[PDB]
Amino acid sequence: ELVLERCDLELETNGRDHHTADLCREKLVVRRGQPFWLTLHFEGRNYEASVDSLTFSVVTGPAPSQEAGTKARFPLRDAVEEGDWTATVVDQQDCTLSLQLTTPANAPIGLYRLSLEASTGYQGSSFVLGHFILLFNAWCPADAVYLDSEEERQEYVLTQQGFIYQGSAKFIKNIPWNFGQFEDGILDICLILLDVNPKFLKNAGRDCSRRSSPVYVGRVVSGMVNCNDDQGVLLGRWDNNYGDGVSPMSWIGSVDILRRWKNHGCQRVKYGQCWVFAAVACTVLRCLGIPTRVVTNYNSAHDQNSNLLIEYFRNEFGEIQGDKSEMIWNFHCWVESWMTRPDLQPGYEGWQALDPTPQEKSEGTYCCGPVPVRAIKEGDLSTKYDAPFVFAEVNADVVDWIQQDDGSVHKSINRSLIVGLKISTKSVGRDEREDITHTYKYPEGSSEEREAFTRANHLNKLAEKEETGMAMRIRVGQSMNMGSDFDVFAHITNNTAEEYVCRLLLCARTVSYNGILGPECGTKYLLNLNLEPFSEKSVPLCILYEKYRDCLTESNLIKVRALLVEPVINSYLLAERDLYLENPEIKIRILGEPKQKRKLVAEVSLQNPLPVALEGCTFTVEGAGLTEEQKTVEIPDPVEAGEEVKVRMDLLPLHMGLHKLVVNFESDKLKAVKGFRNVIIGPAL
Ligand SMILES: Nc1nc2c(ncn2[C@@H]2O[C@H](COP(=O)(O)OP(=O)(O)OP(=O)(O)O)[C@@H](O)[C@H]2O)c(=O)[nH]1
């Protein structure tokens, strides 16, 4: 008799087993290289090896194939064997066959159609079992993305929230972000994002096959975000006016962006900048399975076309003149993902810097990486995918020329600057900052530092100076707040017996995170500054809200610049510092017992730090696990200079475990204020 079956279970169980439970919505989602349960139910009589012959087949792309490893067919048996696409009976009772499928550790990832045919006697029965998505497996020792520790698996693949470090090298700020990779519809969107990539358009079956490599998927996924022109998720913008969309600084996670992309026929979402590029990249990759973590670099030598020596030409005040010069990025962000690397000499497993921010290049404009981080540390520039570029980012040198008024350019000493400070990514499993500078560089003038600089043909720095034994730095005394007046100080130190009479040029300008300077918001110029011997001198500079408010950026960044001139020996000291102005905290109360499918309430508030009223006030809120939906509340009336603004959001968290709730506040005079609360959700009954 021809055997025929009632239904399939593809199961809930595997989700727990595969670390894809939240992801297992209407669909089955598993990670490659790992057995998964599948139970076949049958009408009347069960499967009998003494007659029934079940062979299984799976298919991925639009052009499946045996050679492209994007199709496979295999028989049911008792044990294992080879080829790695296997099916194996685990148990029978009544009319239900309980069995286990395994896919290889290098099967490509994507949507698969699982079909079953008999061959029971002579008469062939044949039909569609169901569908499942197969992903990378940080758990599968044989998979290329394997991590030894559960901790790091959890952090870099499973955790839907974290931190983007922003602010300033001397005051590191951690913006919270909802990566929400397992949020509904997001996996489906990440597939659409690869089924729409330039190479899938060229060949389709080639691309579908190449998605077994995390280097491919990484390079594709990253590139799709903003660069590559044509189709793409985000449109960049930088000039500081974002009225026709949402400003880059206004996003609290990468979910809405993705849905605004898909929900408007895959069109570039209005307005990202580098950290937004990364956070989205991080989401896509995590979703697919490549452990990825967003990284930030302070004083970043971006858009320098690999140049390891940047030079600047500056007037009698210290002001840069080259409108054909590129400024140093206060910070610039990218991501790192984890994979073995079979396409270069061995020993380069690990983190690879993928930078999805398009950079002007030795020919045109595009993305960067993957490149092993270790290579960048080692000086091994020849290592593939943009190693000279990531290297410049972290290792570029800077020469500051002041210009003497007969055509001559006199060299200045500038200690306040070193490219690639404070490289930051969230710790594993905690909210603390990990500092990863050491994975990129060796300490200055160490044995190993110069070993690496040789392999990069850098050298040419430093073991050098002009020595006048005067130093200068910029000091802030204490922290200062957006909306305040406050002072910063030029700090000169004279450690000799000479008494100099000096010129000192102090300048504060509003700036943006990538480096664009605005108008000055305070200046003090001194022409007979008396520095007495073996002494120190602090020169005050008043910076007024009334003076930075018009042009201040949502990054709340002000650059202080100072030039000390010794006229007798013609000596030039330069000191620069980027300040960050604090926003008010967002006070967040969590009301009720945090419980699964139980109403929760979030009380959210801040107090107005400006001396003028806030209008158009709005809070926004989201968090994977806490709401299925972004939530917003517009507060109708102005909030005056004194007072507070408070409102409640209703939440209905559908998942247990820890979740960051992330909140944005917006207003006419005060934008992109951020907040977060860690909420642990327990069980209902
Ligand atoms: N809001 C804000 N606070 C800052 C910033 N930089 C430093 N602070 C805080 O200001 C205080 C002084 O930090 P420092 O960098 O030591 O200040 P400084 O005036 O340079 O003094 P020295 O370190 O002694 O040279 C510390 O509490 C910092 O956390 C900033 O850019 N923005």
Distance 469 CA to ligand 1 centre (A): 24
**Reduced 3-state DSSP string for 106-157:** CCCCEEEEEEEECCCCCCCCEEEEEEEEEECCCCCCCCCCCCCCHHHHHHHH
CA–CA distance, 107 with 143 (Å, rounded to integer): 9
Please give the number of the atom of ligand 1 that sits closest to the Cα of 473: 25
Please give the number of the atom of ligand 1 that sits closest to the Cα of 491: 25
63 φ/ψ angles, rounded to the nearest 5 degrees = -135, 60
CA–CA distance, 642 with 483 (Å, rounded to integer): 12
Q: Is the CB of 599 under 6 A from ligand 1?
A: no
CA–CA distance, 352 with 346 (Å, rounded to integer): 14
Q: Is the CB of 471 under 6 A from ligand 1?
A: no
H/E element holding 171? strand 171-178
CB 47 within 8 A of CB 40: yes
Between β-strands 28-31 and 126-135, what pairing exists: parallel, antiparallel or unpaired? parallel
Q: Which of 543, 530, 439, 436 is CA-nearest to residue 484?
A: 543
Token readout for 572 is 């030039």
Neighbour-count burial for 646-679, b at 16+ CB within 10 Å, e otherwise? eeebebebebeeebbbbbbbbbeebbbbbbbbeb
Q: Is the CB of 582 under 6 A from ligand 1?
A: yes
3-class secondary-structure state, position 393: helix
Q: Which of 171, 552, 585 has most ligand 1 atoms within 8 Å of CB, for mutation?
A: 171
CA–CA distance, 623 with 182 (Å, rounded to integer): 11
> Which residue has the CA at smallest separation from atom 24 of ligand 1?
475
User: Kindly report the CA angle at 29 between 24 and 32, in degrees rounded to 5?
Assistant: 150
Helices (H), 250-314: 255-262, 274-288
644 φ/ψ angles, rounded to the nearest 5 degrees = -120, 160
CA–CA distance, 536 with 458 (Å, rounded to integer): 37
CA–CA distance, 231 with 311 (Å, rounded to integer): 36
Amino acid letter for position 304 = Q
Sole residue written with tokens 């801040």: 606
Neighbour-count burial for 203-238, b at 16+ CB within 10 Å, e otherwise? eebebbbbbbbbbbbbbbbbbbbbbbeebbbbebbe
Q: What would the DSSP string read from start to end of 489-514?
A: EEEEEE-SSPPEEEEEEEEEEEE-TT
Distance 390 CA to ligand 1 centre (A): 29
CA–CA distance, 85 with 74 (Å, rounded to integer): 7
- CA quadruple 63, 66, 70, 76: dihedral sign: positive
Distance 477 CA to ligand 1 centre (A): 6
Q: Dmax of the chain from CA atoms?
A: 108
Between β-strands 71-77 and 55-59, what pairing exists: parallel, antiparallel or unpaired? antiparallel
Q: What angle separates helix 274-288 from helix 214-224, to the nearest 10 degrees?
A: 140
Q: What would the DSSP string read from start to end of 38-93?
A: EEEE-SSS---TTT---EEEEE-SSS--TTTTSEEEEEEESS--SSS-EEEEEEEE
CA–CA distance, 620 with 12 (Å, rounded to integer): 33
Residue 201, preceding bond cis, omega within 30 degrees? no
CA 11 to chain centre: 33
Q: Which of 476, 485, 488 is CA-nearest to residue 545?
A: 485
- Residue 96: beta bridge partners? 41, 93
CB 106 within 8 A of CB 131: no
3-class secondary-structure state, position 214: helix
Q: Is the CB of 493 under 6 A from ligand 1?
A: no
Please give the number of the atom of ligand 1 that sits closest to the Cα of 577: 31
Token readout for 15 is 């989700």
Question: What's the full length of the chain, in residues?
Answer: 685
| Terminal Cα distance for the chain, rounded | 48
DSSP state of 488: E
CA–CA distance, 654 with 18 (Å, rounded to integer): 20
Q: Which of 569, 593, 586 is CA-nearest to residue 667?
A: 586
CA–CA distance, 574 with 416 (Å, rounded to integer): 8
3-class secondary-structure state, position 209: helix
Token readout for 160 is 């839907």
CB 505 within 8 A of CB 317: yes
Sole residue written with tokens 């685990």: 90
CA distances in angstroms from 72 to 32, 75, 103, 107, 618, listed in the order given: 14, 10, 10, 10, 53
CA–CA distance, 398 with 154 (Å, rounded to integer): 40
CA–CA distance, 289 with 80 (Å, rounded to integer): 26
CA–CA distance, 213 with 342 (Å, rounded to integer): 10
Token readout for 536 is 């120190």
Q: Which of 286, 337, 41 is CA-nearest to residue 178?
A: 286
H/E element holding 285? helix 274-288
CB 302 within 8 A of CB 358: no
Between β-strands 517-531 and 536-543, what pairing exists: parallel, antiparallel or unpaired? unpaired
The residues near 452 (Cβ < 8 Å, ≥ 6 apart) are 377, 378, 379, 442
Q: Which of 476, 118, 590, 508 is CA-nearest to residue 317?
A: 508
DSSP state of 158: I
Sole residue written with tokens 């980027």: 578
CA 672 to chain centre: 18
CA–CA distance, 348 with 370 (Å, rounded to integer): 11
CB 384 within 8 A of CB 371: yes
**Elucidated via:** X-ray
> Which residue has the CA at smallest separation from atom 22 of ligand 1?
475
CA–CA distance, 323 with 510 (Å, rounded to integer): 18
Nominal resolution (angstroms): 2.8
H/E element holding 576? strand 571-580
Q: Is 267 exposed, middle or buried (0-12, 13-18, 19+ CB in 10 A)?
A: middle
Q: Which of 165, 174, 476 has most ligand 1 atoms within 8 Å of CB, for mutation?
A: 476
The residues near 245 (Cβ < 8 Å, ≥ 6 apart) are 269, 270, 271
CA–CA distance, 662 with 588 (Å, rounded to integer): 10
CA–CA distance, 167 with 575 (Å, rounded to integer): 19
DSSP state of 160: -
User: Kindly report the CA angle at 508 between 507 and 510, in degrees rounded to 5?
Assistant: 145
CA–CA distance, 59 with 72 (Å, rounded to integer): 7
Q: What would the DSSP string read from start to end of 314-379?
A: E-TTS-B--TTSPPPEEEEEEEEEE---TTSSTT--SEEEEEEEEEE-SSSEEEE---BHHHHHHT
Q: Which of 276, 202, 204, 275 is CA-nearest to residue 233?
A: 276
Amino acid letter for position 210 = R
Q: What would the DSSP string read from start to end of 535-568?
A: -EEEEEEEE-HHHHTTT--TT-EEEEEEEEEETT
Q: Which of 45, 55, 49, 38 is CA-nearest to residue 3?
A: 45
> Which residue has the CA at smallest separation from atom 4 of ligand 1?
479
CA–CA distance, 632 with 619 (Å, rounded to integer): 6
Token readout for 199 is 């190479």
CA–CA distance, 312 with 334 (Å, rounded to integer): 26
CA–CA distance, 268 with 247 (Å, rounded to integer): 14
CA–CA distance, 506 with 346 (Å, rounded to integer): 52
Between β-strands 486-494 and 470-475, what pairing exists: parallel, antiparallel or unpaired? antiparallel
CA–CA distance, 540 with 522 (Å, rounded to integer): 11
Q: Which of 165, 168, 170, 582 has most ligand 1 atoms within 8 Å of CB, for mutation?
A: 170
45-52, Cβ contacts within 8 angstroms, sequence gap of 24 or more: 45/1, 45/3, 45/95, 46/92, 46/94, 46/95, 46/96, 46/97, 47/3, 47/92, 47/97, 51/120, 51/121, 52/3, 52/118, 52/120
H/E element holding 634? strand 631-634
Residues tagged active-site: 274, 332, 355
Radius of gyration for the alpha carbons in the chain, expressed in angstroms and rounded: 29
Could you give all domains of the chain from N- to C-terminal order, each with its CATH number? 1-144 (2.60.40.10), 145-469 (3.90.260.10), 470-584 (2.60.40.10), 585-682 (2.60.40.10)
The residues near 66 (Cβ < 8 Å, ≥ 6 apart) are 72
User: Kindly report the CA angle at 24 between 145 and 663, in degrees rounded to 5?
Assistant: 85
